[model samples]
Target chain A: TPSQKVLARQEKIKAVALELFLTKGYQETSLSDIIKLSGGSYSNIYDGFKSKEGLFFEILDDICKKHFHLIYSKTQEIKNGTLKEILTSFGLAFIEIFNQPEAVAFGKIIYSQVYDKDRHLANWIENNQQNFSYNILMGFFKQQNNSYMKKNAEKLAVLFCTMLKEPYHHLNVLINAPLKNKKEQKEHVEFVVNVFLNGINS
Target chain B: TPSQKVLARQEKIKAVALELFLTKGYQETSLSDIIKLSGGSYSNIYDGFKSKEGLFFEILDDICKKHFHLIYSKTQEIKNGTLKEILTSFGLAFIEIFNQPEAVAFGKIIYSQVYDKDRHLANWIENNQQNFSYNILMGFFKQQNNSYMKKNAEKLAVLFCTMLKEPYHHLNVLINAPLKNKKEQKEHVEFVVNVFLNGINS
Candidate 1:
């Protein structure tokens, strides 16, 4: 019972730590608070992860890896369609990611890390989010390898990423401050997607 | 002789202070360093400006205000064939701003202020640069009310801004680092302008 109890307690610690870090911030969460909530000693926690920074890194790594895998998996599901339909599907997929509370929280955490010299978080966000998005955009461009779109796919991809950026920035700004309703979120997504589509399409 | 001596000393002090602040960051440079270089007292320096931050603000305000006036003044000089030519002239005037050393230094100083909360540098940059460009663009749209260009001007304005931004951001990154030959700068501006023209024109 003691060994099984330790295992259960460790799992609880990670869950609560992530929840607190997501809601409150890295600076606000304390090690003692985590111990009291986890029912684990400082040594036990140190044995698993060295510090609060270590624990935060672990949580970020897990979330980012999972999100990247999910996005990559969805790329295969984009059935062959006209350019407009393909772009609409791309927009829908992105909107779905923002719909997740954890993803939204993770976005805020990573953005705040922009000035950090650690480099790990930004690299992870780029590879996981941006690189995958680039691949998907390039895939669509390859499908429509006409003269115009072929020459401009890279620019379009970058613009597509930038267009999605402000809405995410706005959402992150308001995430803990104030939540948006479903209709508001839908309208925000549609407006960005439409402008992007208009900017590039023939 | 003493009166002329004081005038030369004052000019030398401001020149040295600006040189140091431009090379070292605003935070890294100190009043004491300026005093040592100029053989002036702390009291005299404090008499000229309330504090280091106050002095920097004065420089910032002067720089931004002068540039804003320059653009405003230039907008009146050109008579255009079409609305597009007028808008293009405004964009060309910005190229001239980018060429001036004081303006470029002012850009670096204000760009470093985007992280600060109370500073209006970012708004100043956008208002003088992007917002004014947008206003001229809207003028073009109104001028071409019956043409298909009206439908595309907003999108074209944004695209033109985007093309210019790539060069603008690069300028900051490479400030005073290299020389662009007159031919090179001309070709670069023409390349950007033509891309937008071709992208939108039927």
Candidate 2:
């Protein structure tokens, strides 16, 4: 019961902290502010997370897990689809997860932290987030029997990730202007997938 | 003679300011530091440029001007090439300019400044750097005389620019590590060009 209570409190703290961090920015959102908003004890918060940065990482880890879980579940639904269909599904799935308000907040924070001397956050994204997407793409490529596709699968995966990162991630985080609606997002994903699958020469 | 000396001093101050801004960051580098580095009087510095922000803008304007000038000149050399050749040339030219040490430093500074409330610097970039690239791409699309391309020239131009922005600009700016050598950069340019020109379906 005590452990359950502790976990609940941690969740509450993260929700409040995410709000404050999104609105006030990382530098401006202090532990005191989080404590005041979450109504959690300092000792309990410290026990759960060593510091503010630790708490932030915990939130990021939770987000990443949730996103990857969604992708895994979605992969099952698209098992019978063509490569284009599968990729479009994946692209739509990614936009669905990443375009959320909370994800946008996390993106803004993580982008700002990329240049920090301590590479912990950046390393986590590269190793965890990027690697997850890459593996999923590689899995898709492996299913197809084409030798050229097999040979260039890794490069293609990276490029697909870049497509998402730019108009979706970069625009959302940097400009605070993401694709307006699902239609626009889907159109974008289709264009990228089509261009990636075909060639622009035609 | 005095005017010539004054112009030379202004150039020296700009050189010093650019170096300090790149290495020390915008907020950290002060007028005092620039003066110390350039051995110029405060009055002379202020006489030439209104303030620190003005001086920074001057440097940015100069960089933008030089970049556009280079692009314009390079456009002539690719007049007879195919769409792919022209795009590859454009992509390589961008890498040549943007991948420089000073450009990298400037990118770090400008990117951080994008979120500033004033938006003067961001507006300058949108008006200058982005417009120049977009127009060039639009010109290429128009030359082809295809109905689809002509109809969507604006969108295609934007997408083409997005292609460059991702693998090229985003990596070089965010991560200190970009593609290591010119050869790698060329390969990257070619791959992106191929994907854009041809669909990835095959």
Per lDDT, the best of the predicted structures is: 2
Model 1: colliding residue pairs: none
Top candidate on DockQ is 2
If you assessed candidate 2 against the hidden native complex, which CAPRI class would it receive?
A: medium
Those runs of model 2 whose alpha carbons end farther than 4 Å from true positions after fitting are A1-3, A35-40, A44-48, A98-101, A129-131, B1-10, B35-54, B129-131, B164-169
Q: Which residues of candidate 1, in runs, are more than 4 Å off?
A: A1-78, A92-132, A164-202, B1-23, B26-63, B66-138, B146-202
Estimate the TM-score for candidate 1.
Answer: 0.55
lDDT of 2 by residue, A1-202 (tens): 9999878878888888778777787868777787777663445555536556667877877877777778867876879888888888888887677667777777666666545666656556566645365578887886789886788888787778777656556656665664447887788788778778876666
Candidate 2 lDDT over B83-179, as tens digits, reads 8888887778776676677777776665665456666564564556553655777878887867878877877777766666565566566656554
True contacts kept of 1: 0.00
Q: Residue-wise lDDT of candidate 1 within B1-202, one digit each (tens)?
A: 9789765655576666787788775657777777677665334743344445445654555555665567656765664564445545656665665655665555454434433444344334434454344455555555665554666666555545544444344334323334344565565556455444443122
Which one wins on TM-score? 2
DockQ, candidate 2, comes to: 0.49
